[PDB]
């Protein structure tokens, strides 16, 4: 999967021979939950690695255990790049070149804000409806949800969480200084501040 | 009186208009409503203590 | 007064012609960070040099130096 080129291929049998003989299959998966949590969790051992592999290794390709098989091929290709440079094949990518730098402007940032806020609403809406089932029991049949809904939204929730995060400049992700107050002295400044 | 970055300005020129400018500020006194039911009431404070 | 007189020129420690037109001494870490290294102990220090002079036979001849 890495490469069919013989010169590059001869530098991988070494690495292969040293470790693949010691660890068989699926026991490395066991070692993750071992190394993660020190203290006997026997059942939990396998399952912790599932959490770690799926929620950390390349989450842009997938989150289910079936998606692993795809990242597999992907991970190989990434590794290849490293090995050839030690043999000399390319020229180190300078990270200040504007081809590999992209700006996330005001549009895309506000999406990340709206997503978390809308998530909190849906979660608060679920709990409320459940806490209205035991004390009210049965109402009119097809108009159960059609009233359960409106009583259990309290709209102010989504609204406030949008303002207070944008007006203080401390976003939920951890970034700060996202919003500044528009510097208004002498026309040239405002126009300059917008860019 | 102009050494090391100072500048001398014609007196008459100031006095006829050059570089005159105005500063502005604005205050925002509101009317808070306490939860207990009382309110502020903007009245001339009665000469008391 | 000894502390202040030695800590004042560090502020006025501007550049020099770092790329001189010379050959022999090369990259000896001049500037303000040099002063910091001698003021501290540090067994290790970056780019050491030792100077060797010669006696009265090797003093004026290329093949013997």
């Amino acid at each position: 999967a890495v490469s069919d080129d013989p010169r590059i291929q001869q530098v991988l049998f070494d690495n292969l021979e040293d470790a693949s003989d010691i660890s068989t299959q699926e026991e490395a998966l066991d070692y993750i939950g071992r190394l993660a949590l020190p203290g006997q969790p026997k059942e939990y051992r396998l399952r912790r690695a599932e959490h770690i592999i799926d929620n950390n290794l390349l989450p842009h390709m997938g989150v289910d255990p079936e998606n692993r098989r795809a990242k597999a091929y992907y991970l190989g290709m990434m590794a290849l790049k490293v090995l050839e440079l030690s043999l000399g094949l390319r020229g180190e990518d300078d990270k200040d070149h504007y081809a590999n730098k992209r700006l996330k402007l005001a549009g895309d940032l506000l999406k990340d804000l709206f997503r978390v806020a809308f998530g909190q609403l849906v979660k608060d809406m679920q709990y409320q409806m459940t806490k209205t089932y035991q004390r009210k029991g049965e109402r009119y049949t097809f108009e159960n949800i059609q009233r359960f809904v409106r009583n259990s939204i309290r709209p102010d929730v989504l609204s406030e969480r949008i303002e207070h995060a944008l007006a203080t400049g401390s976003w939920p992700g951890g970034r700060t200084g996202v919003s500044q107050l528009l510097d208004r002295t002498n026309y040239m400044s405002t126009l300059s501040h917008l860019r | 009186y102009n050494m090391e970055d100072a500048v001398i300005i014609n007196k008459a020129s100031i006095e006829r208009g050059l570089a005159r400018s105005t500063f502005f500020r604005t205050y925002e006194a509101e009317e808070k409503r306490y939860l207990g039911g009382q309110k502020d009431n903007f009245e001339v404070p009665s000469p008391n203590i | 007064v000894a502390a202040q007189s030695i800590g004042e020129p560090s502020t006025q420690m501007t550049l020099n012609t770092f790329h001189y037109a010379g050959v022999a001494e090369i990259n000896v870490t001049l500037g303000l960070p040099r002063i910091i290294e001698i003021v501290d102990a540090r067994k290790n220090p970056s780019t050491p040099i030792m100077t060797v002079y010669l006696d009265e036979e090797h003093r004026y001849d290329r093949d013997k130096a």
Binding site: - | - | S5, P9, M13, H19
Partner: protein
């Protein structure tokens, strides 16, 4: 009767002491309770401290305002190991033998280590080595000399539990737990004679007191109850944890004394051990922080005295101060070198106490009568009792009656009060200097221009602060020891620091050039502008051909005293032979006639003889911030007070000529004719073609590479040297053609905002453009900008500007110049950062040293750092360029004054 603090002797509080210094036993575990009538019988004001509007205390009344809190105690039912001494307790326990009290050493061994205790009684560092050797030697033994050795088990530690791997059946090694009671009863056997052989004291710090038996309670005043919004009492952390102590304590005594199920004692004991550990230090090791029901960790004692933001750097060692002002500065060279202008608005908000005695009684009566409004008024009056009476409200007449000597009036600042001045950052020593107040109408501080190298100030909005000392001892001290005139020479190097700046130097040149004939009207007008005050001796009119008029040298000569003989070559010379034709006529004669060859003068060899400037011209070798050997000599030979008048009168003189004579710079000052322009152009063509030839040599593999560097770097190294010559070669052409008699080069050669390098950089090549050493490499994959062909290492491609600032930069070249200009911007703000921290190190290491009267530098522990200061004995503020007395100067000076007559 008003003593001062001699010493401080630290130690350990004994249980015995804690009972007398306690005011009451705290027993009720509660706080206030509730919203009205806050008085309990345990932890609150049970003769402990007052905080409420209720006067009750321990008999002394003494309301909450100004009432030092009193301590309490808690009689702990069982002994408790102090966490802070744990590590030391180990050193004591496993180094001595149980039941006896001996240090497990024979008498002989003990006897001889006594003699190492008197020889080491001052150096804390080298005694710690000797304690640990005893420590290490005792730990590896099992044979006490006073119990016959019955097999001594070994101790354990970490974090606060102890064990002993004994034997009891036949060969077992069970781990018997250790209780504080057990430990305590074993330490009281160690006799008092042995504590010096350990790390303790017999009277101040007994070892058994390390096991806490009584806990002293902090007073009420140190435990304030902050309020949250407006009705919530967010209790203090100390109070809560103390309350927690009494709640477990109270159940403890009742639960063991009545029923004894044994099991409870084990759990309850360690919890108390756990709990006390948090009170001493909440950030301890191995101890879950006991928080309040909110998530906020409690800051106990070890987070109170310290925790990187406690009470040394925060409120003790640094404060804002009173009696100050802060504003912008603007220049005015018409006041004396030490005076300062204070805006009249600031003068009325700052006062000084005066203490009327008998000779200024008349003056002050008028001041206090004038009230707080007019300028010579007053604000307060202080009676001998101490109550300050404010002169504002409705009348000031009845105050200004018979004043009665001994009172004190706070008058506004008048002309002559001493005031300091600060720039802030206070880098060198000279940044705070005492000035003399002069008051003028407007709103800036006026600072005389030569005092603006020491502050390192400019004038584009920089702000300065001024504070006014008050007490008579302090005020006097400031005027005698810190005034400006005592600081013309800098302690860093042997040279003058306060001197002429930009216009002062350049104007001095125009006044003293060959042919500066000033008509009679001007001379007369300018001696009245420079303070000096002469009688009817302008005399005698050197040239009367055109009109009766005056040579420039004689007007300048009216300032130097009548005996200064000095001679030195200066910067403006350009003909080393004509200087030397005159250099022998001073040696072999020492007093010639002025007429022969001194009137065959040069413009660069300053010759002054007995108060008369025969030959030479004045530039930055007389005045100025760097070395000037005229102002220098006049402060050594003729005290300090003379120098300020000579400095002051030179300034106002030199300015008056420069103003009335005209000193502009136009745009034609940088212009060269057509022939000289073509001369530069052929140089840039050849230099480019030389670089091309080297590149072609690199391609064909005939390189001939330099020794050290690799082939790729040899190419670059050769190229940079080729172009640096070509830029400087163009500069030689610029220093050759445009004459020395225009108003721009004049500024460059004398030293008044000059460098010949930038005047040439305005009419010739700029040169290469570098970034921290290498040439421009950072760009696209194979080139710098996208306007050149990929793979061009040529001169023009890799950043070499050919056009000057006059003719104008092209788009490629202009962008290259920006890359070189950002370098200077970034650096200057970064270099300051490392300097400031570095200075804090050396100040906090050397501030203790003083010079004793016998000339010896001693540190505060009497360890002599240097026999005869600084390789004796001349102070760097008064020494001559590293040397001392200077025999070469003294000989010529005294021999000339006597032989000349």
């Amino acid at each position: 009767m008003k003593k001062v603090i001699g010493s401080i002797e630290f130690g350990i509080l004994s249980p015995q002491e804690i009972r007398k210094m306690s005011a009451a036993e705290i027993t009720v575990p509660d706080t206030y309770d509730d919203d009205g009538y806050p008085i309990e019988g345990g932890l609150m004001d049970k003769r402990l401290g007052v905080i409420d509007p209720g006067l009750r205390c321990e008999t002394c009344g003494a309301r909450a305002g100004e009432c030092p809190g009193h301590f309490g105690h808690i009689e702990l039912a069982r002994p408790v190991i102090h966490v802070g001494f744990a590590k030391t307790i180990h050193r004591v326990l496993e180094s001595t033998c149980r039941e006896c009290g001996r240090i497990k050493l024979t008498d002989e061994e003990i006897e001889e280590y006594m003699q190492k205790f008197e020889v080491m009684g001052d150096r804390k560092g080298a005694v710690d080595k000797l304690i640990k050797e005893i420590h290490k030697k005792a730990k590896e033994r099992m044979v006490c000399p006073h119990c016959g050795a019955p097999q001594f088990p070994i101790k354990f530690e970490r974090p606060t539990i102890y064990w002993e791997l004994r034997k009891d059946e036949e060969g077992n090694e069970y781990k018997h737990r250790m209780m504080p009671s057990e430990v305590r009863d074993r330490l009281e056997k160690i006799p008092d004679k042995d504590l010096p052989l350990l790390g303790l004291h017999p009277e101040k710090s007994r070892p058994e007191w390390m096991v806490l038996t009584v806990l002293p309670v902090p007073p009420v005043t140190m435990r304030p109850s902050i309020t949250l919004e407006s009705g919530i009492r967010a209790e203090d952390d100390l109070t809560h944890k103390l309350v927690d102590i009494i709640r477990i304590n109270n159940r403890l005594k009742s639960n063991i004394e009545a029923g004894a199920p044994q099991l409870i004692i084990e759990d309850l004991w360690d919890l108390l051990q756990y709990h006390v550990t948090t009170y001493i230090n909440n950030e301890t090791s191995g101890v879950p922080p006991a928080k309040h029901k909110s998530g906020r960790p409690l800051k106990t004692l070890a987070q109170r005295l310290k925790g990187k933001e406690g009470r040394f750097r925060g409120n003790l060692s640094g404060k804002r101060v009173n009696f100050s002002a802060r504003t912008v500065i603007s220049p005015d060279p018409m006041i004396s070198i030490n005076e300062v202008g204070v805006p009249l608005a600031v003068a009325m908000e700052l006062t000084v106490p005066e203490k009327v005695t008998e000779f200024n009684y008349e003056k002050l009566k008028q001041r206090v009568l004038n009230g707080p409004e007019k300028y010579p008024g007053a604000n307060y009056v202080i009676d001998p009792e101490g109550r300050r009476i404010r002169l504002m409200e409705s009348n000031r007449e009845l105050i200004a009656e018979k004043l009665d000597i001994g009172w004190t009036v706070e008058r506004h600042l008048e002309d002559g009060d001493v005031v300091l001045f600060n720039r802030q950052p206070s880098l060198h020593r000279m940044s705070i200097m005492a000035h003399r107040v002069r008051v003028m109408p407007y709103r800036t501080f006026r600072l005389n221009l030569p005092v603006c190298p020491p502050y390192n100030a400019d004038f584009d909005g920089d702000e300065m602060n001024l504070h006014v000392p008050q007490t008579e001892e302090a005020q006097a001290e400031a005027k005698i020891l810190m005034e400006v005139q005592n600081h013309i020479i800098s302690p860093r190097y042997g040279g003058p620091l306060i001197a002429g700046i930009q216009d002062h130097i350049s104007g001095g040149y125009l006044l003293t050039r060959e042919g500066a004939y000033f008509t009679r009207y001007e001379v007369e007008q300018m001696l009245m502008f420079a303070g000096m005050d002469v009688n009817e001796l302008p005399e005698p009119d050197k040239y009367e051909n055109g009109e009766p008029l005056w040579s420039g040298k004689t007007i300048f000569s009216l300032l130097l005293p009548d005996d200064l003989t000095i001679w030195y070559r200066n910067k403006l010379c350009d003909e080393p032979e004509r200087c030397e034709a005159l250099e022998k006529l001073i040696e072999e004669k020492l007093i010639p006639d002025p007429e022969e060859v001194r009137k065959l003068a040069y413009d660069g060899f300053v010759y002054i003889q007995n108060g008369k400037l025969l030959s030479g011209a004045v530039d930055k070798k007389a005045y100025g911030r760097e070395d000037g050997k005229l102002l220098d000599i006049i402060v050594r030979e003729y005290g300090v007070e003379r120098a300020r008048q000579f400095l002051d009168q030179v300034t106002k003189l030199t300015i008056w000529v420069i103003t009335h004579k005209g000193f502009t710079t136009a745009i034609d000052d940088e212009d060269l004719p057509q022939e000289a322009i073509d001369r530069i152009h052929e140089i840039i063509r050849e230099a480019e073609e030389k670089v091309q030839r080297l590149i072609e040599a690199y391609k064909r593999g005939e390189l001939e590479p330099l020794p050290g560097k690799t082939l790729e770097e040899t190419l670059e190294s050769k190229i940079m040297a080729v172009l640096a010559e070509a830029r400087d070669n163009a500069g030689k052409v610029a220093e050759r053609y445009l004459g020395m008699n225009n108003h721009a080069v004049i500024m460059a050669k004398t030293g008044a905002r000059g460098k010949i390098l930038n005047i040439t950089q305005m009419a010739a090549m700029l040169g290469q453009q570098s970034i921290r050493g290498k040439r421009l490499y950072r760009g696209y994959r194979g080139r710098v900008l996208t306007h050149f062909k990929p793979g061009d290492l040529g001169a023009r491609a890799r950043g070499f500007v050919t056009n000057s600032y006059k003719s104008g930069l092209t788009p490629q070249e202009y962008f290259f110049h920006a890359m070189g200009g950002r370098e200077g911007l970034v650096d200057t703000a970064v270099r300051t950062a490392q300097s400031g921290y570095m200075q804090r190190r050396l100040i906090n290491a050397l501030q203790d040293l003083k010079v004793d009267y016998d000339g010896t530098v001693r540190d505060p522990t009497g360890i002599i750092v240097q026999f005869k200061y600084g390789e004796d004995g001349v102070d760097p503020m008064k020494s001559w360029q590293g040397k001392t007395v200077d025999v070469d100067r003294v000989i010529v000076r005294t021999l000339l004054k006597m032989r000349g007559g």
